[PDB]
Design an enzyme around this catalytic site. Structure first.
Site, mmCIF file in Angstrom:
data_model
loop_
_atom_site.group_PDB
_atom_site.id
_atom_site.type_symbol
_atom_site.label_atom_id
_atom_site.label_comp_id
_atom_site.label_asym_id
_atom_site.label_seq_id
_atom_site.Cartn_x
_atom_site.Cartn_y
_atom_site.Cartn_z
ATOM 1 N N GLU A 60 0.827 -1.201 0.000
ATOM 2 C CA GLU A 60 0.000 0.000 0.000
ATOM 3 C C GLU A 60 0.868 1.261 0.000
ATOM 4 O O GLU A 60 0.503 2.284 -0.582
ATOM 5 C CB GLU A 60 -0.925 0.026 1.218
ATOM 6 C CG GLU A 60 -1.859 1.226 1.232
ATOM 7 C CD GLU A 60 -2.491 1.482 2.594
ATOM 8 O OE1 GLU A 60 -3.070 0.543 3.170
ATOM 9 O OE2 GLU A 60 -2.406 2.626 3.084
ATOM 10 N N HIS A 61 2.023 1.190 0.656
ATOM 11 C CA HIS A 61 2.934 2.335 0.715
ATOM 12 C C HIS A 61 3.680 2.589 -0.593
ATOM 13 O O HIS A 61 4.185 3.683 -0.818
ATOM 14 C CB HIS A 61 3.964 2.132 1.826
ATOM 15 C CG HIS A 61 3.517 2.620 3.167
ATOM 16 N ND1 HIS A 61 3.999 3.782 3.731
ATOM 17 C CD2 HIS A 61 2.654 2.092 4.068
ATOM 18 C CE1 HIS A 61 3.456 3.945 4.924
ATOM 19 N NE2 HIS A 61 2.637 2.933 5.153
ATOM 20 N N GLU A 137 5.432 5.224 11.313
ATOM 21 C CA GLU A 137 3.996 5.093 11.517
ATOM 22 C C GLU A 137 3.703 4.107 12.638
ATOM 23 O O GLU A 137 2.718 4.257 13.352
ATOM 24 C CB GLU A 137 3.310 4.658 10.223
ATOM 25 C CG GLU A 137 3.380 5.728 9.141
ATOM 26 C CD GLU A 137 2.732 5.299 7.846
ATOM 27 O OE1 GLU A 137 2.536 4.077 7.662
ATOM 28 O OE2 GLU A 137 2.434 6.184 7.013
#
Ligand SMILES: CCCCCCO[C@@H]1O[C@H](CO)[C@@H](O)[C@H](O)[C@H]1O
Ligand SMILES: CCCCCCO[C@@H]1O[C@H](CO)[C@@H](O)[C@H](O)[C@H]1O
Lengths: 442, 42, 99, 62, 49, 424, 145
Positions: A60-61, A137
């Site tokens: 996703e990153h 994160e």
């Protein structure tokens, strides 16, 4: 001039087509000059092993960091210059990439998604950059007690299973996952038969299908004999995880019993029950007059800052319960009233409150499907879970079938004398002992 | 009402990615509700 | 004249000899305690003083000079509007509870 | 498609508190009679011929 | 990271019927509870006697 | 399938000045909002915070419904009642299934036209001001933007959306009655409905919504002043906003600023993206390798406006980020502006505007805001055309107005390296 | 701080300096609220080590002999390694308005004047008394102010 019942029938049916490679294409046409189109994938940490847990999140990153056709920021610049928005999200069972754009740009939007989902670069230097962002994160998520306690609840309720895993994965995996690990993960899960191309807005199904045939036909519809990833059942375990940290100002507690799973009809009566208990936070204006006894008691006695019931669903199991945030001296009282309310519903839900629950659930359903993005996601996710879009007219029928008797029986089935999973974080010295919590279930 | 606010009130950022979007671009709006958490925008 | 007997009863009851007003003598149940809490400051402070003065007289087994006795014609209900509303609100809640 | 004994006992007698209560009650009555008779039988057997009830016939008819 | 937190293995303490992590435990919950409540019930009848 | 229609927005201006507007979308749920020119700009130094308490008092007893009945009655139908405020307007909105609109409508009318503001209820509510403010203020942006306005204006628009601390526990019932009577008047209101027929909404307004003194007691013109408020609090990150007076909403110059905002960058378009087409972000990045964020800031009001940018950076880098952002604006003002940029900006703005009205909430707010600001409705078609009409020279002149205009600034965090306006 | 701040003059004079200077003299004599509970032992040690040095000190005595103050200073106050130094106060100008509804308004308006010790400082001291620098008569009408 139009009853609520007629407004239900006036909703345009969702159109579903399928490509040769297995990719499903679904849309709900509206008159909006904007739309949302995206790809929902049957991929998530539940498909990951201890080894590559975090893989999906890593992808996703990198998903918007450049494709072979549009290297680096080229993809980004294209999305931006047409004023579109590109977003994504990963959960334990689903992943999605979607675009909000002007209806007229549907063609470029479908192309960009196809490009992202098939030609993602996964450059080596970008993978190293994202490795650091993810570690950062993880540190940020550590400061969100809500995130932490929900991850703990999963870790203990589904201990020893893939659902125990967090979406982001352990920090050691973020440090070691390699392009190979990621490409392996992608080749194995990103298959046409596991994807849904959904769209909502001012567009026609045929046009979307047209675009899908043109851009997603090359998407693989196969993956070896022992490749086809399959979900095994995930055992639920009555248990408790307590992370005592007296340095934190407020305690977070999440408690749940095992839920039925997405496809189960019981979910409607359970949503009605949860709507009766409801949610609450210190900024609500109702205070002492709130209909929910829990919210009412909470407010007048200042027992918590907030609380929320939830029904988290997975393939064949789920977490049905509540989460609350309160002062260290109020945990016991909150738990006492919360459990008291579950027992009250199991044995004495009344017709008037069940009618209030039904009405809240009706309003939640309709007010939620407001806008192209919520509708588009409902399409993407519904096809993956139910295998079809469930129409509001059907939801209404299912809700209408619920009465006090049904609420008592369904709540009794999932709550009454069942073992819960309990997660606590913060100044939790007053969190009741598990035996006491368990006894509170009957 | 029936729907709970995205963020429940009670009384982070460690990277640029999580920072992007935090900068304010529009005038403040303040909302209070009977059934839903309060919110502040922009 | 019902009123003839009323003024006679008012004086026979005798809380006026302690300088009290009829509402100062009401038995305080929960409705009444809430009504009192809602009283404006001056009415509340006045009630407090008339009661303090009455309790003090009672303690000494004395009464006020007749010229200071509360007069039947002047005794008015300062509590009624607050208490009536408190009772209407509670009745409303009970109706909803019954549903 | 088959529940075990305990799972069956749970659903019918132990889940509801009122039924669980009625199971202990009737349970106590049936238990008392059978326990007392069985226990007594063991006692009288261990003491066969020694108790009054065992030699009583030799003197009765009164 | 809190995501490094994993529940320890309890296989050594688990009842045999909940040892398989790929099987739902609800299939045995009635039996598991029935047993315990039989004990409780029997203890109660013995104490009442 | 083929959409339900699509019907048009019905408008109606009653004789008393009240505007009614409704759009039948044949949706299963309705949404009604009563918009009023009663935002905090109408408070004066004697009753500051009154409109905040007012916003929190929507469930207090009314002449037609007790506090208890409002909460229980609206929850019984699974409905919702909320109050939203900005510095100029207040919007009371209810949501419910369409069959229950009569119920929500009566509660909405009681709350807005018949509040009693009982002494004990108002007193017991004051603590809520503290809770509501603390929650809002957990957002550094809230501190900064409130301080920004207080620094920019001498009055009116300078007022905070949140009650000053000294006023908490001091807002009186008479103050509230005063506020409602002076601003909740027919010519300062608009009843907007979604998913309800215009005929009924109109009958409701005609029968229950009249209150002369129509124009009401608005306020003095907002006087821009300029200044700076620095709030030291040691946060690792410094939040700062730098603005100049721009243009009143509705004017042509306002569009030039909206376009300028999107040339500079007005928010992320891609999750975790690098904001490739954002002029300010790229300029800053080309000089700061520290984590940061920057965005163009645009606040347009009825009689004034604020335009500039907002930065978030580590304390030590505050001055570099702010100066780099500012120098990028100067260059636009110098004429350095690609037409391809402006085109990208217009696309972002046009797409953004359309997306903002695709949900019932956004739509109601747009119609509601236009009804009060311009007492008319400009459809999207026209707005888009108006955006296209903006010239590159207009964007450059908006930039020049910012650069040469007296500035207003607000910052919070560890300000050891955060510049003063005169160091920019 | 709460005790000091009961005086409106304290609020005003602290805000005056914060408004007048960019640094140094802008600092309050009172700890900012966000720092209460956060001042560390290391901060205290360093503050003392950087500023409590011989070249930044004066030992003044009244009713004590100079010889002993001198012996005390030579034997216990010979301390080096400070910072004599400190950023030059930079006058800036500005205004801080604190709305609080008091029936009375306290306000101060100033401009940068002169450093103590300079000749211009004496002109300002005289100017201060031309304008009026405090009461001379109890309940008087300040005729010469
Ligand atoms: C216990 C007997 C109760 C009789 C009712 C009292 O009646 C009252 O009696 C007073 C003195 O006689 C009169 O002055 C007065 O007018 C009369 O109403
Ligand atoms: C000792 C018993 C305390 C009773 C407190 C009642 O309190 C009242 O309840 C009403 C509900 O109908 C509210 O509308 C009203 O604002 C509130 O003050």
């Amino acid at each position: 001039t139009a009853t609520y019942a007629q407004a239900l029938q006036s909703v345009p049916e969702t159109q579903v087509s399928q490509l040769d490679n297995g990719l499903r294409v679904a849309s709900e046409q509206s008159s909006q000059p904007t739309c949302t189109v995206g790809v929902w994938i049957d991929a998530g940490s539940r498909y990951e092993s201890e080894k590559n847990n975090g893989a999906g999140y890593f992808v996703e990153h990198l998903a918007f960091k450049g494709t072979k056709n549009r290297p680096g920021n080229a993809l980004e610049k294209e999305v931006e210059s047409m004023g579109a928005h590109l977003n994504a999200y990963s959960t334990r069972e689903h992943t999605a990439y979607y675009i909000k754009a002007l209806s007229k740009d549907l063609p470029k939007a479908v192309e960009l998604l196809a490009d992202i989902v098939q030609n993602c670069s996964l450059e080596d230097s970008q993978i190293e950059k994202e490795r650091d962002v993810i570690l950062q994160e993880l540190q940020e998520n550590d400061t969100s007690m809500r995130d932490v306690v929900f991850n703990y609840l999963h870790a203990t309720a589904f201990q020893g299973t893939p659902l125990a895993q967090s979406v982001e994965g352990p920090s050691e995996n973020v440090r070691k996952l390699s392009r190979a690990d990621l490409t392996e993960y992608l080749s194995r899960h990103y298959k046409a038969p596991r994807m849904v191309l959904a769209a909502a807005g001012g567009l026609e199904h045929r046009q979307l299908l047209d675009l899908a045939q043109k851009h997603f036909s090359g998407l693989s519809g196969t993956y070896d004999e022992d490749a086809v990833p399959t979900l095994s059942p995930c055992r639920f375990t009555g248990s408790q995880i307590c992370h005592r940290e007296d340095g934190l100002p407020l305690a977070h507690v999440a408690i749940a019993v095992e839920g039925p799973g997405w496809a189960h009809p019981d979910n409607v009566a359970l949503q009605v029950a949860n709507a009766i208990i409801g949610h609450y936070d210190c900024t609500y204006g109702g205070g002492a007059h709130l209909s929910s006894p829990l919210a009412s008691i909470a407010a007048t006695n200042k027992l918590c800052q907030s609380f929320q019931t939830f029904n988290i669903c997975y393939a064949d199991t789920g977490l049905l319960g509540a989460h609350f945030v309160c002062d260290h001296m109020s945990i016991d009282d909150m738990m006492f009233v919360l459990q008291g309310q579950w027992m009250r519903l199991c044995t004495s839900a009344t017709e008037s409150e069940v009618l209030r629950g039904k009405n809240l659930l009706r309003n939640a359903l309709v007010s939620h499907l407001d806008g192209t993005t919520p509708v588009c996601e409902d399409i993407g996710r519904s096809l993956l879970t139910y295998g079809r879009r469930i129409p509001l007219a059907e939801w209404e029928s299912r809700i209408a079938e619920v009465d006090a008797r049904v609420v008592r029986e369904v709540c009794s089935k999932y709550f009454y004398d069942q073992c819960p999973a309990v997660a606590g974080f913060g100044p939790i010295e007053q969190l009741p002992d598990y035996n006491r919590i368990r006894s509170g279930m009957f | 009402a029936a729907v709970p606010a995205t963020s429940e009130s009670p009384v982070s950022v460690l990277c640029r990615e999580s920072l992007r979007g935090q900068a304010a671009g529009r005038p403040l709006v303040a909302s209070v509700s009977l059934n839903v958490p309060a919110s502040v925008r922009y | 004249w019902l009123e003839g007997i009323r003024k006679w009863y008012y004086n026979a009851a005798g809380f006026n000899k302690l300088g009290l007003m009829r509402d100062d003598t009401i038995h305080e149940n929960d409705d009444v305690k809430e009504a009192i809490r809602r009283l404006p400051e001056n009415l509340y402070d006045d009630r407090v003083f008339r009661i303090k003065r009455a309790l003090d007289l009672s303690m000494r087994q004395q009464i006020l000079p007749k010229e200071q006795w509360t007069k039947y014609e002047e005794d008015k209900s300062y509590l009624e509007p607050y208490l009536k509303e408190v009772i209407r609100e509670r009745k409303e809640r009970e109706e909803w509870a019954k549903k | 498609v088959a529940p075990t004994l305990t799972a069956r006992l749970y659903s019918l007698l132990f889940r509801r508190t009122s039924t669980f209560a009625l199971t202990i009650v009737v349970g106590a009555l049936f238990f008392e009679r059978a326990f007392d008779q069985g226990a007594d039988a063991i006692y009288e057997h261990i003491n066969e011929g020694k108790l009054w009830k065992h030699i009583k016939h030799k003197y009765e008819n009164k | 990271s809190h995501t490094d937190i994993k529940v320890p293995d309890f296989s050594d303490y688990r009842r045999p019927e909940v040892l398989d992590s790929t099987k739902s435990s609800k299939e045995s919950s009635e039996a598991r509870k029935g047993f315990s409540y039989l004990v409780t019930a029997t203890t109660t009848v013995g104490v009442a006697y | 399938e083929v959409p339900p229609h699509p019907q048009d927005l019905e408008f109606t201006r009653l004789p008393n000045g009240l505007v009614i507007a409704s759009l039948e979308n044949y949706a299963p749920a309705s949404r009604i909002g009563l918009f009023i020119k009663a935002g905090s700009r109408y408070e004066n130094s004697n009753n500051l915070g009154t409109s905040h308490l007012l916003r929190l008092a929507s469930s207090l007893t009314t002449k037609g419904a007790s506090s208890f009945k409002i909460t229980r009655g609206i929850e019984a139908v699974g409905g919702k009642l909320s109050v939203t405020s900005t510095r100029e307007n207040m919007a009371y909105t209810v949501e419910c299934l369409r069959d229950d609109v009569d119920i929500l409508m009566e509660f909405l009318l009681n709350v807005t036209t018949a509040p009693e503001f009982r002494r004990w209820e108002v007193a017991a509510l004051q603590p809520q001001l503290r809770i509501d403010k603390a929650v809002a203020l957990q957002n550094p942006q809230a501190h900064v933007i409130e301080n920004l306005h207080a620094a920019a204006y001498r009055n009116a628009l300078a007022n905070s959306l949140y009650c000053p601390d000294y006023r908490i526990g001091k807002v009186t019932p008479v103050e509230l009655h005063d506020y409602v009577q002076n601003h909740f008047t027919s010519a300062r209101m608009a009843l907007i409905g979604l998913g309800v027929s215009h005929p009924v909404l109109k009958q409701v307004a005609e029968q229950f919504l009249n209150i002369r003194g129509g124009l009401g007691l608005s306020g003095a013109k907002a006087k821009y002043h300029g200044g700076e408020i620095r709030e030291q609090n040691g946060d690792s990150l410094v939040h700062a906003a730098l603005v100049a007076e721009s243009a009143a909403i509705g004017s042509a110059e306002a569009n030039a600023f909206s376009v300028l905002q999107h040339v500079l960058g007005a928010g992320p378009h891609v999750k975790r993206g690098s904001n490739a087409t954002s002029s300010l972000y790229q300029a800053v990045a080309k000089g700061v390798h520290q984590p940061f964020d920057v965005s163009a800031f645009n606040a347009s009001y009825s009689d004034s406006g604020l335009f500039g940018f907002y930065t978030i950076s580590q304390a030590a880098s505050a001055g570099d980020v702010i100066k780099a952002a500012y120098n990028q604006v100067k260059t636009i003002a110098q004429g350095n502006l690609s037409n391809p940029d402006v085109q990208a900006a217009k696309n972002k703005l046009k797409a953004g505007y359309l997306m903002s009205v695709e949900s019932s909430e956004g739509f109601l707010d747009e119609v509601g805001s236009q009804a009060l600001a311009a007492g008319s409705y400009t459809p999207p078609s026209t707005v888009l055309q108006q955006i296209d009409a903006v010239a590159d020279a207009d964007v450059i002149n908006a930039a020049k107005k910012f650069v040469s205009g007296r500035k207003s600034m607000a910052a919070s965090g560890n300000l050891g390296h955060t510049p003063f306006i005169d160091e920019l």
